[PDB]
């Protein structure tokens, strides 16, 4: 249930469609009571590009919020505080430790739902100090992480994750360890690298029993989609296809199922057909990419590479048709693909055979040590010049 809030903030960000996404974004925060915070949250939504809030000076006020919702949430939050202060007065009369903690911890989560970060931290703080169930302890720290993922401030995500991360392993709860993977999984799509995310999702479908999560079916549909992006045919084949579990369950997947199947059949005509449509279909509805360039660039390298690895020669017609796009577009794409060194093929258009040399060799692994070393190398010089003054 709360994971959709996090996906929805993500959608105006997609460079593939700014406007439609705004209407997706509004829906779930209106129900939950984010209205009160939303005036402050709105500035983050501008970076993400457009917001349809009542106090928004953004382009789409076509699905603008009514004034009454802002006010209704605000009265509701004060009313909730009024009950709480009073609970607190009662608490001394019973046990100090039990009653004040239960109320303080409940107040924090409520504050977190709204997206008030400041009020959350303080309210939680007392509960941590005091004795409370180990499983409950891991769910409350995840809520502080959950506010930051909504907020889309990157620096903020880091702090919470590191703290939560120590407490999960210390604890006995396996089911809870899984919950953190999903929250972190949202984080992984949020940054440019999509690859990292798939693994968290594969684990979580098995174990993360429903509470703080959507229905089993809507989670499985996310699961297969993300698995396709990271994993090539051997990896995909063993992991998903081999299983007992899918046959027993029965499919409700066919659209996403075709995208997984095409890779295996190694017919890129079927692949590319599924790819133009799927990209638009899945990505817009729920976030797995605020940066559309990364997704297609990685899929296209794999679709070409895999066709080439298995078959030395092809005709231009087959090549044009299977890949989809123009011969002209294809010829530019290749040049970038070659640079990596894993593809290394030549194309004869004047003799109409596209040859693939295909060296599996030490050069491929060698290439990797040399390439990766560059980012780090540049970065220390910069750290050192700062530290010294």
């Amino acid at each position: 249930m709360p994971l959709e809030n996090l996906e929805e903030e993500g959608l105006p960000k997609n460079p593939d469609l700014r406007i439609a996404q705004l209407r997706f974004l509004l829906s779930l925060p209106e129900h939950r009571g984010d209205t009160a915070v939303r005036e402050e949250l709105m500035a983050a939504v501008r970076e993400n590009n457009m917001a349809p809030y009542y106090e928004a000076l953004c382009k789409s006020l076509d699905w603008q919020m009514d004034m009454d919702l802002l006010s209704k949430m605000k009265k509701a939050n004060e009313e909730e505080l009024k009950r709480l202060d009073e609970e607190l007065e009662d608490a001394e009369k019973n046990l100090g430790e039990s009653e004040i903690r239960d109320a303080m911890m409940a107040k924090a989560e409520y504050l977190c739902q709204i997206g008030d970060k400041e009020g959350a931290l303080t309210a939680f703080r007392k509960t941590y100090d005091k004795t409370v169930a180990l499983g409950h302890r891991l769910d409350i720290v995840f809520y502080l992480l959950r506010i930051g993922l909504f907020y889309m401030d990157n620096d903020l995500i880091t702090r919470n994750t590191e703290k939560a991360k120590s407490l999960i392993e210390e604890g006995g709860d396996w089911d809870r360890r899984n919950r953190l993977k999903v929250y972190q999984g949202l984080y992984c799509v949020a940054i440019r690298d999509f690859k990292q995310a798939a693994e968290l999702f594969l684990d979580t479908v098995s174990t993360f029993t429903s509470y703080e999560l959507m229905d089993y079916k809507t989670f499985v549909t996310y699961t297969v989609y993300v698995s396709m992006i990271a994993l090539e045919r051997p990896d995909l084949r063993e992991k998903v296809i081999k299983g007992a579990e899918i046959l027993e369950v029965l499919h409700s997947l066919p659209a996403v199922r075709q995208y997984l199947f095409s890779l295996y059949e190694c017919r890129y005509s079927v692949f590319f057909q599924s790819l133009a449509v799927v990209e638009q279909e899945m990505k817009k509805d729920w976030l797995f990419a605020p940066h559309y360039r990364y997704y297609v660039r990685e899929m296209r390298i794999h679709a070409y590479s895999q066709l080439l690895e298995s078959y030395r020669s092809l005709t231009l017609g087959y090549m044009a048709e299977a890949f989809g796009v123009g011969v002209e577009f294809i010829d530019q794409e290749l040049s970038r693909f070659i640079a990596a060194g894993r593809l290394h093929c030549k194309i004869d258009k004047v003799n109409e055979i596209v040859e693939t040399n295909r060296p599996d060799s030490k050069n491929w692994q060698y290439q990797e040590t040399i390439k990766k070393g560059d980012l780090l190398l540049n970065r220390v010089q910069k750290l050192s010049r700062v530290i010294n003054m």
Binding site: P15, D16, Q280, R293, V296, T315, G317, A320, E321, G324
Partner: peptide, 24 residues
Amino acid sequence: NVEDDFSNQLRAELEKHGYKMETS
């Protein structure tokens, strides 16, 4: 680099259909 994603989705679906007729 350059934004390959906007251009590829539109091109891949459309071009491929003409290519079906043109070549195998």
